[PDB]
């Protein structure tokens with residue numbers, strides 16, 4: 044599951060250029076547009092009836108900031124993702140009742156958003172490193188389910 | 190995975206009653222019957238034309254016995270499945286070129302075979318312990334892929 | 336595609352199941368909750384205690400839907416239309432979980448059908464359950 | 477099922493890919509081999525490293541098949557009939573891998589189509605690639 048030192052440097056380098064609040068809203072929004080059954084967790088967020096209604100939804104945007112904020116913090120602990128996300132794992136299981144498959148879907152959407160934003164800079168090896176990361180984060184968030 | 194002492198006991202107890210030869214032949218055979226694209230690895234085994242030919246094939250039976258034999262040995266390393274299957278992981282990756290998804294398919298077929306044989310004795314908690322085992326083995330065999 | 340041979344295998348197997356269907360549905364759910372605990376995330380509103388009457392009730396609903404699917408195996412998309420609507424627009428269970436329940440139904444049938452659970456019937460049952468799952472997720476997006 | 481809007485979106489986006497189809501197919505394959513090394517098990521006879529003539533050639537074939545699918549978007553099971561035969565009876569790639577290539581195709585399109593890869597078009601492309609994948613595995617058993 045682990046990245047080479049070259050990959051860790053690649054992840055950190057690209058992430059330094061990422062507006063986490065913005066990419067967070069974009070990623071969560073695209074999750075809800077591309078896989079609309081994931082809207083099941085966000086009835087309280089209001090209008091989710093169109094792609095624009097989802098992407099521009101202020102509550103979707105706000106939650107995206109929160110989610111990718113936690114994701115961002117975890118990038119400082121690539122050697123201990125399970126420990127890092129243990130309490131969020133427990134919370135998403137016990138309180139939020141979120142199927143961990145959703146973490147995998149979000150990871151893939153985030154990779155697409157990074158590709159969209161960075162273009163050719165999101166090279167195949169940079170993608171490979173980020174695939175290791177999102178798989179690791181999704182597995183870590185899944186780890187304390189019971 | 191991490192098995193509880195209670196589950197480790199249940200796994201070892203049921204397995205003490207398993208005819209590895211029959212169950213191995215049955216498991217590999219049903220894999221080839223239920224998911225027939227898996228026959229792609231066994232052209233040299235000869236006749237795989239019909240279910241009866243698959244199940245009754247001597248090389249299918251023999252290979253099933255060998256495979257389940259290694260599976261059996263792995264049950265002595267439940268807290269270090271990745272360590273014990275590391276050699277076979279590299280072998281299946283580099284020499285045999287076997288998609289690890291096949292390990293998961295075989296694992297589920299094996300569970301069905303065990304249920305078919307043991308009937309009501311294959312209780313829901315016993316199944317849950319064996320699902321941990323077959324997932325752990327599949328993941329261990331996949332772990333050294335590159 | 337379910338072959339004519341698949342359909343005969345399914346009808347015969349489920350015919351043997353008979354009035355045990357509801358029971359086997361509940362057993363499959365219990366096996367699923369224990370073997371694949373993430374599936375419990377869809378039932379936080381349920382009583383999941385041992386022998387839960389609520390789980391048993393749900394097992395009967397799942398089984399009755401399958402019994403109807405078997406009876407209309409030639410035209411399952413139409414027979415399961417209302418249920419497919421509910422799954423797509425309300426329940427919204429992630430598609431990966433249908434494979435987990437299908438597996439647990441297969442294990443349940445295997446444990447209760449020592450004679451009927453032949454390799455061929457096993458294959459047909461798996462195709463059938465996958466086909467039902469496909470219909471139930473067909474309107475998701 | 478692909479909606480009228482899906483088909484409009486897919487035709488527009490793939491049209492904008494245009495002459496780059498082969499290039500993008502090969503890039504998607506490379507992204508897949510690097511991101512998901514298990515997929516390399518299906519190409520033991522290939523040079524899989526960057527600048528591979530075999531991967532470039534295969535990328536062209538994959539892309540051309542997608543172009544045909546787009547041209548026959550309302551009849552893909554028949555337009556891709558020979559190819560689905562080949563996959564079911566010879567190649568026999570496990571179904572899980574089609575999602576991996578589909579994802580890498582999306583990433584490739586996103587990296588090359590800044591203006592075109594909107595959330596709605598992203599959704600339509602994902603549905604389209606899943607539909608093609610379903611056709612290619614439809615004769616497996």
Ligand code: HNI
Pocket residue numbers: 081084085087106109110111113114131134135139141145146149180184
């Ligand atoms: C599709 C569903 C879904 C996904 C994919 C997801 C993915 C993630 C990921 C993946 C990288 C991370 C790091 C993350 C982090 C967080 N989520 Ni998730 N969450 C999801 C559904 C939720 C919901 C629902 C809440 C509560 C929202 C609310 O209404 O307050 C939530 C709340 C949080 C919170 C706030 C905790 C609290 O309220 O105490 C954090 C932090 N999360 N979420």
Ligand code: HNI
Pocket residue numbers: 227230231252255256257259260277285287291292295326327330
């Ligand atoms: C679908 C294909 C497939 C699956 C699911 C599978 C699953 C497994 C599992 C799962 C628990 C185990 C423990 C296992 C163990 C083994 N395999 Ni598998 N293998 C598979 C395809 C092969 C092939 C192919 C060979 C070589 C064939 C031969 O010539 O014997 C093989 C050879 C072996 C050998 C012999 C090694 C040697 O000769 O040095 C062992 C041991 N294995 N295989």
Ligand code: HNI
Pocket residue numbers: 374377378393396397398400401418421426428432433436467468471
């Ligand atoms: C893991 C989650 C999950 C899976 C895989 C699944 C798969 C299936 C399958 C697959 C073969 C069938 C035939 C089936 C049938 C049904 N489900 Ni499922 N359901 C699931 C979670 C639910 C939930 C949750 C409900 C709502 C139950 C309630 O009472 O709130 C539900 C409700 C139903 C109902 C009740 C409809 C109604 O009341 O009008 C039927 C019938 N189903 N479900």
Ligand code: HNI
Pocket residue numbers: 515518519534537538539541542559562567569573574575577605608609612
């Ligand atoms: C991970 C493995 C894998 C995947 C996901 C996959 C998915 C796809 C998809 C999905 C959208 C498409 C449109 C597609 C199209 C094609 N593939 Ni794929 N193929 C795959 C592995 C192969 C292999 C292996 C070959 C044989 C290539 C060779 O040259 O030996 C192949 C050959 C082809 C050919 C050449 C046919 C011929 O020679 O007559 C086409 C066209 N394909 N493949």
